[PDB]
Amino acid sequence: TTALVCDNGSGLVKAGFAGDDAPRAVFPSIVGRPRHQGVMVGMGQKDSYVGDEAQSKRGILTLKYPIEHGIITNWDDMEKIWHHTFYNELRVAPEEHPTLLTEAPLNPKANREKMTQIMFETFNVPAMYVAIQAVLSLYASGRTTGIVLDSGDGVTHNVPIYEGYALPHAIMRLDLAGRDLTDYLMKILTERGYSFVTTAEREIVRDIKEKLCYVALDFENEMATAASSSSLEKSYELPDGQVITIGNERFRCPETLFQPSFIGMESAGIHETTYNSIMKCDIDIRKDLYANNVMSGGTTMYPGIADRMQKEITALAPSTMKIKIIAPPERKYSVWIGGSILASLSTFQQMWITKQEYDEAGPSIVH
Amino acid sequence: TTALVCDNGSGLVKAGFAGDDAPRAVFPSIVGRPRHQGVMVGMGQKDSYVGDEAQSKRGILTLKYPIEHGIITNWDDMEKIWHHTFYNELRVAPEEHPTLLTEAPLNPKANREKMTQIMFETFNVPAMYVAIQAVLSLYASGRTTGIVLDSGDGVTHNVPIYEGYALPHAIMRLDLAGRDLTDYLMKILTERGYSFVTTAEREIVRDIKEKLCYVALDFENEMATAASSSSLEKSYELPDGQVITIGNERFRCPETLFQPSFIGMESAGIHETTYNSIMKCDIDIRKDLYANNVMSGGTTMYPGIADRMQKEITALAPSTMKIKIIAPPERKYSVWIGGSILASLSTFQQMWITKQEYDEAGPSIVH
Amino acid sequence: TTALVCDNGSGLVKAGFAGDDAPRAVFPSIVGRPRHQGVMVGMGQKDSYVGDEAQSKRGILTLKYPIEHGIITNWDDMEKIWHHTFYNELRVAPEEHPTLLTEAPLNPKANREKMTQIMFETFNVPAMYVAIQAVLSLYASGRTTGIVLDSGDGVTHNVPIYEGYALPHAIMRLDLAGRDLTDYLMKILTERGYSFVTTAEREIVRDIKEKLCYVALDFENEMATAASSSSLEKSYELPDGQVITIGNERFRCPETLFQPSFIGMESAGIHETTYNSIMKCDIDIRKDLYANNVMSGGTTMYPGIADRMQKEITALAPSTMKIKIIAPPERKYSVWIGGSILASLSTFQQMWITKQEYDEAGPSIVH
Amino acid sequence: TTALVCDNGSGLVKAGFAGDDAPRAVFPSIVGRPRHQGVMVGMGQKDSYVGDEAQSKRGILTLKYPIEHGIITNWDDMEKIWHHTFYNELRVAPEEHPTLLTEAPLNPKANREKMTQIMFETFNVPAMYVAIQAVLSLYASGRTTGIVLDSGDGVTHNVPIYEGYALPHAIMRLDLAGRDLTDYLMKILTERGYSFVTTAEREIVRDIKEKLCYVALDFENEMATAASSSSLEKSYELPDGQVITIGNERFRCPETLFQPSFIGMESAGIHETTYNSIMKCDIDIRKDLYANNVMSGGTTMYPGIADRMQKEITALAPSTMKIKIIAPPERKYSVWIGGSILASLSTFQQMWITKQEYDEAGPSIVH
Amino acid sequence: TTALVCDNGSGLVKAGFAGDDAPRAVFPSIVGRPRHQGVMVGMGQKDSYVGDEAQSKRGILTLKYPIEHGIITNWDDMEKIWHHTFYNELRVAPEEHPTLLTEAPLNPKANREKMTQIMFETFNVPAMYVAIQAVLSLYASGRTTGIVLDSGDGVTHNVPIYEGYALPHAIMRLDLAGRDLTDYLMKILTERGYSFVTTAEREIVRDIKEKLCYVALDFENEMATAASSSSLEKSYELPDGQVITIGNERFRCPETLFQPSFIGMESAGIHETTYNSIMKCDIDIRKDLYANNVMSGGTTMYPGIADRMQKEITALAPSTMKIKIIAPPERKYSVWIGGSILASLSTFQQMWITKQEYDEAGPSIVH
Numbered sequence A, B, C, D, E: 001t002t003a004l005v006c007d008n009g010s011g012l013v014k015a016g017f018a019g020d021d022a023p024r025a026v027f028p029s030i031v032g033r034p035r036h037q038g039v040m041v042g043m044g045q046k047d048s049y050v051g052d053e054a055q056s057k058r059g060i061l062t063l064k065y066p067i068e069h070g071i072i073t074n075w076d077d078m079e080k081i082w083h084h085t086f087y088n089e090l091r092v093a094p095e096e097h098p099t100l101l102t103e104a105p106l107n108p109k110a111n112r113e114k115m116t117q118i119m120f121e122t123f124n125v126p127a128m129y130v131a132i133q134a135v136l137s138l139y140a141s142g143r144t145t146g147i148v149l150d151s152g153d154g155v156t157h158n159v160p161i162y163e164g165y166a167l168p169h170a171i172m173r174l175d176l177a178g179r180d181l182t183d184y185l186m187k188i189l190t191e192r193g194y195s196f197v198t199t200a201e202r203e204i205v206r207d208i209k210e211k212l213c214y215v216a217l218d219f220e221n222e223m224a225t226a227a228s229s230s231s232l233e234k235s236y237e238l239p240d241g242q243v244i245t246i247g248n249e250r251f252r253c254p255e256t257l258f259q260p261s262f263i264g265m266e267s268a269g270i271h272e273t274t275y276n277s278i279m280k281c282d283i284d285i286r287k288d289l290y291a292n293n294v295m296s297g298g299t300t301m302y303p304g305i306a307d308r309m310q311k312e313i314t315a316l317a318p319s320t321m322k323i324k325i326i327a328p329p330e331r332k333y334s335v336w337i338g339g340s341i342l343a344s345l346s347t348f349q350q351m352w353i354t355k356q357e358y359d360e361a362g363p364s365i366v367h
């Protein structure tokens, strides 16, 4: 009889019932067909592996992300993610609940429809409601105010919300992190001879992004001392035998997040987009948009931020302003801890769209 | 009514019904015509002895192998092998079954056609299927993963297979063992006065290859102490009166398998071809390609391997990697214990080519 | 007193003074040691033959390419290439000039250093400058705009340049042609029994790639009709007696350039990488990136391109766009006809690095 | 209507129909003219007596052997042998049968022709076939394998035959026994004063060779004790009055068969020629060429052999080899018991040469 | 003070100082003991005649070749060859020089040791070096390339050498000419009644091999017309009275060199061993291994070859290949004209083994 909060990101999909902790189930959200012909009977071999097995059996597959920079590529793969998940994982009936879905803040509609509809006719969840992914990130620390800087693979957003309404027109969306960070790392690792060309192997790059990373505080001056013999290099070992020693670029790569000329895209860094998004609000409210940046996603896990972000803003921000940049631990699940709280809470159950109200208007009314 | 798994190697041809133990019949696979004129009435004397009698009455024949380094030389002898076998040995009708054949992995087509076709019109087995000889060697201990090193007279192969699909391009085929090992032993036995010129007599060389052999662990250092008077020589006795004492070279000859400069061939040793075939796969998978080399054939019967193979690879292989080099006893019939399991197993019976489907395409479609 | 533009490719190394025609000297760039022991006094025999003689006396050597897939393997052989070239060929002093070198566009540094440095202290060329190999290929027909597709053994590149700046991030580098094309041809020639195992012998394969080749226009439909008896096969004659007749596969092998599944590599074909590199530029500029593909290298010598490339792009490219694929004759020397023009031209002479400026920084400043 | 197997030796010519026992007629094969003038009316006396009467009336003749050491001397006497035999003995018509003759294995051709032809035109036997004297000696006890040592006056042979073809080149023919043994005995009997100068009288010597003979086992040690007074001498009585007592040399003379220095011929003894013929065969076959020496002729009648031959061989033969020296009783007719079996047996009747096939080629085709 | 190049063949041993023409001394290389008892005081009679007197006084000896089919039988006779030669012929001191010896290419070691050592301790030549008999045959006409077919009694070899290193493994050694040709001629001369049993007399056979011999061009067809009465027979006269008339077989006997079935040996003729050795090299080099067969020895003195050899090869060789078969006059001393050039030439003097360097290693190091 439960209700299910299921967030589709380009993750790391998260699923777990209406509370109370963290997603019961998390997996990399990939389908990969076998790029070769199989010959050991059964037929045994699957037509396509979904996660998590499609992350355990790389190299013999071609990973294809069903979603990509917010808008998904095709629901043929997406629906299979879904069907696989509801039926053979959580062991939850389709008529169990009214569900709660998330999207990007400005994703081209109808990218919400085709989802809502296919999921509606196939899985027959008797209702529906979609809350934007940024808004939910506030329900983590349970604040009512603040500018939310939510960056996960592969779409970031900067949505300012006051108590308790939210300014719609003051939001700037950058197509930056994180596949561009993975790809940039893969492009600058070539500087030391390591070739990471194939689709499957790209995943390994992401892991060297995981452990071996830190954002400097004063890049321009730090680069000089990086050349000094003292190793700012840590050597990671790769799933086979190989031992790879990356340094210098280790702190260079994430820095791309600010100063994103390195990628060849003109929109200025998160540095500047935060401020320029804030002074797109009303002059009076700004006092409390500052000192309340609450970060989220899986791309605020770097040991660089937030005091990088801090010294960076304080140079651009007006003077005489106190700026706490409170960002929790556990942030990777922040959004989810949001959603859980919501559908269990009174009373927005009655701003849902049930079945009777999908026979009248249908594809519209969703917004 | 049974089905028959029959493998043609440069053996030692093996035949036995769809399971369950080992070939019912094994013989050296030779035809040899009598190099002399016969005068003992009847006419009595046969035009040519096939095995096994052609291995019991050597010296009065000129042994001619119907196949040689993978591709067969002529089907005139080959078909006669076949007809003789089916009709006067196994006592099996031609319409008894649909059959199962093996080939080399990269044998020049149409070396499979002329066989399939001649056997199709002559012996009329109402169906057909040819599985590659390396793949079958996994079905012995019933593993699903691994790089298979299958080396028999006279073509070796190195096929890496993951679970369960098989990488086609990571296979390197060396025309090495085993006639070159026989011929080389015959070339290095000459230094001690033993002349082994005649075709028939060469078989005897092969037998001294059998019993009197062992691969060292550290050749270069072992050779010094080999010169010491202490006999690492065992004296074998030859079918006539002669007593032959070979030492030193007894372990030198097989060593040719690595470091095949001794032959005057540039392709590097099995040592290097194993690794060089392995890192021709995808970087992530190698962890399990290692520690599962399953050897097969009749040339992995030396009491040297695998800790020779082991110590050698570990020097070329990356560090910190565990390498089991599991190779069964009973390996001589490994391939066959594979085949039996296959055609008896559901359900790939419907991946066959029967008679009705050889009326359409014919010489093609076999692959 | 002249200045020398010397480009190291995996060629076919090219050398000739600052203009005005084509390299004075071209040779296959190989060192090969004699795999055997020599016994006719002098000592006569060299420790290792460099080109061109190392291409006249194959079979008694083991050819070892000093560079391989962009990054060179070792400067021990490379330096000998150099020393041999400067001293005993062109008859040019080391202090004669400031020089001009090329590299790959994204070659792992320091693959440019060790060269620059060893060449700097050994040969003492009082200056230096290295222009990327793609950029020079535009100076042939003397265009200022276009996407350059430069594919030679053994690294291709796709660099888009506008007037007159060049987009750095829109370049995709495929490790495809040409040793993979040679090796693939050698791998599919085995299908008809021809064994091409030895290192030296591989060269002959390359020559059958030369004359006997052509890329089809509609492969999928062409393969059927290829089976028809009408010979699309031309019979080539081999340096010894043997006459080898390759057909069908004659056009199949080069086709690998597109669809590189045949090799077992996932990175999509040149077809798709050209386009995917182009629409990684800015949306407005694309109008002139199209209709100006200028091809180069020695692997765009097939009589297939460019209208194979054309029909292929027009299927992937947006509609209503005219796509010229201008690629000169003489392309094999295109790069060089570029370089010569450059160092003779004002004024980038003062963007050089002379000796006085290598006592300060050294290993840095080169980029 | 029967067929006749007739063997010409330097005997003791043997004749008897196609089976089934032994020759119907045996006689010493000599013609002898009367060396004196005859004067007792008739004129009565024959121009020349053939055997057997020419062996009843010695002393009044000059015995002249029609054949001598394989090659016959002249067919003028030989034909007279034949005509006399066929017409006035067996009482058989000339057109009765197709005939079967033997020769030496290596008798100088055409020593077979002049026979075949003369008998063909004179006696008109409508067909012909000539089988070699050695091969037939196997047909006695009906074995299929073995080295045959056939020594009769006056040409021995050593032919190795395997089952069932026969090695032609491994045969060594010594012009030794038996007229050389007779002549030697006559040469050493002078040692005790007995004069045997005349040709006729020589026959008597042969008889003292018959009864009074034995081959020692250890000559050298036996010779010492032979000198002891103990009579190893048996006293034979000669057709006239005289009583001759020979000892010592009685066993010395036959020993000449081995150690034939005594004659002044260097070619080593039958002892060594057996072995030296055997190891002129193939290395594999020797195992069964040994242990199957089947003797024949009339010079293997000595009570010394075969265990003399044995102790001699085992010292020369390789060790650990079992050597049967099987020699029947009745051996004197061995060859003939062969022929009977042959021409009576199907089916080699059609390997004959009849007359219709002798008008075409004639003197040729016989081989 | 000169140095001596001395070649031991089964000849015809040749000796003459370091250049410049031909051996000062040549003789048939035989020792022969007197098979009889001598009674003419002095003691007068020698214990054993070495050549040449042992070739002047046949018939009173038992000729025993000190070497036989490459490996020598015993150094007791060989040493006497040596001592006799150095001391009572060339009038040369033992310490005069460092010496140069030849061997077969694949003679069973240690067949070089026992020589090197005995000669070293007895004759005390302060150094040593042994070059293989085949290689020297190139130094005659002074070529650098080619496959050498060096056939003398009683071991032929086929050693292919490129410029300038030498392929070791492409050599096939046939135990053929010449004692097998002498013996074969003696075996087929019996066909016309001539008996040649004794060893001494065999020398005469060899002489009839000398003058009265010639190899046909198209044998099988030549035999038909050979039967025609027109004498292709030349009549030789024998040292006693006897006149011997040989025909037919006169050209048949040498023909045995190809098609050695006549002997009963399975290894195919020199015909095939030349080609089969050539295509045992690398594919590229063959172009110049052809058209450069330089023959040597004493068995290429037949007036048949080389256009026999030519027509034979061209039928087996691949088409469109030019095949010169250059073989000098004067060839009998070719090898020696080689040796002279060598030890006189710089600089391989320092690849010798002297006195000081034989106290350390001894029996080894010779190779």
Ligand SMILES: Nc1ncnc2c1ncn2[C@@H]1O[C@H](COP(=O)(O)OP(=O)(O)O)[C@@H](O)[C@H]1O
Residues within 6 Å of the ligand: A008, A009, A010, A011, A012, A013, A151, A152, A153, A154, A155, A178, A179, A206, A209, A210, A211, A297, A298, A299, A301, A302, A332
């Ligand atoms: N510890 C970490 N350090 C750095 N980056 C991380 C870490 N954990 C996850 N990431 C990155 O965060 C991304 C996942 O973010 P996620 O919150 O799943 O975004 P979404 O919810 O939009 O899918 C991954 O692409 C990964 O590269």
Ligand SMILES: Nc1ncnc2c1ncn2[C@@H]1O[C@H](COP(=O)(O)OP(=O)(O)O)[C@@H](O)[C@H]1O
Residues within 6 Å of the ligand: B008, B009, B010, B011, B012, B151, B152, B153, B154, B178, B206, B209, B210, B211, B296, B297, B298, B299, B300, B301, B302, B332
């Ligand atoms: N105990 C042994 N030691 C070494 N080699 C052996 C042994 N037993 C057999 N062989 C060799 O193995 C070969 C048989 O291999 P096999 O597995 O039959 O190859 P295939 O199946 O391809 O014919 C024989 O030629 C023989 O020389």
Ligand SMILES: Nc1ncnc2c1ncn2[C@@H]1O[C@H](COP(=O)(O)OP(=O)(O)O)[C@@H](O)[C@H]1O
Residues within 6 Å of the ligand: C008, C009, C010, C011, C012, C013, C151, C152, C153, C154, C155, C178, C206, C209, C210, C211, C297, C298, C299, C300, C301, C302, C332
């Ligand atoms: N006529 C031709 N057809 C096809 N390929 C060719 C032809 N001529 C040369 N090639 C190939 O082009 C390559 C030479 O390219 P090159 O311009 O030297 O590249 P790089 O300069 O990077 O070494 C050689 O590897 C050769 O295989």
Ligand SMILES: Nc1ncnc2c1ncn2[C@@H]1O[C@H](COP(=O)(O)OP(=O)(O)O)[C@@H](O)[C@H]1O
Residues within 6 Å of the ligand: D008, D009, D010, D011, D012, D151, D152, D153, D154, D155, D178, D206, D209, D210, D211, D213, D296, D297, D298, D299, D300, D301, D302, D332
């Ligand atoms: N008991 C015997 N002992 C020794 N020699 C004998 C004996 N009987 C016969 N011979 C010899 O054997 C010869 C006859 O043997 P035979 O088989 O006829 O020889 P061939 O077949 O060559 O004519 C006679 O010359 C005779 O001297």
Ligand SMILES: Nc1ncnc2c1ncn2[C@@H]1O[C@H](COP(=O)(O)OP(=O)(O)O)[C@@H](O)[C@H]1O
Residues within 6 Å of the ligand: E008, E009, E010, E011, E012, E013, E151, E152, E153, E154, E178, E206, E209, E210, E211, E213, E296, E297, E298, E299, E301, E302, E332
């Ligand atoms: N003119 C000739 N014709 C045929 N054969 C010959 C001729 N001269 C010599 N021979 C044979 O060739 C042999 C000489 O070969 P040789 O070159 O001396 O070999 P090696 O030098 O190895 O002893 C002799 O034994 C002889 O029988």
Ligand SMILES: [Mg+2]
Residues within 6 Å of the ligand: A009, A010, A133, A152, A153, A154, A155
């Ligand atoms: Mg998100």
Ligand SMILES: [Mg+2]
Residues within 6 Å of the ligand: B009, B010, B133, B152, B153, B155
């Ligand atoms: Mg096999």
Ligand SMILES: [Mg+2]
Residues within 6 Å of the ligand: C009, C010, C133, C152, C153, C155
């Ligand atoms: Mg290039």
Ligand SMILES: [Mg+2]
Residues within 6 Å of the ligand: D009, D010, D133, D152, D153, D154, D155
């Ligand atoms: Mg006889």
Ligand SMILES: [Mg+2]
Residues within 6 Å of the ligand: E009, E010, E133, E151, E152, E153, E154, E155
């Ligand atoms: Mg010789």
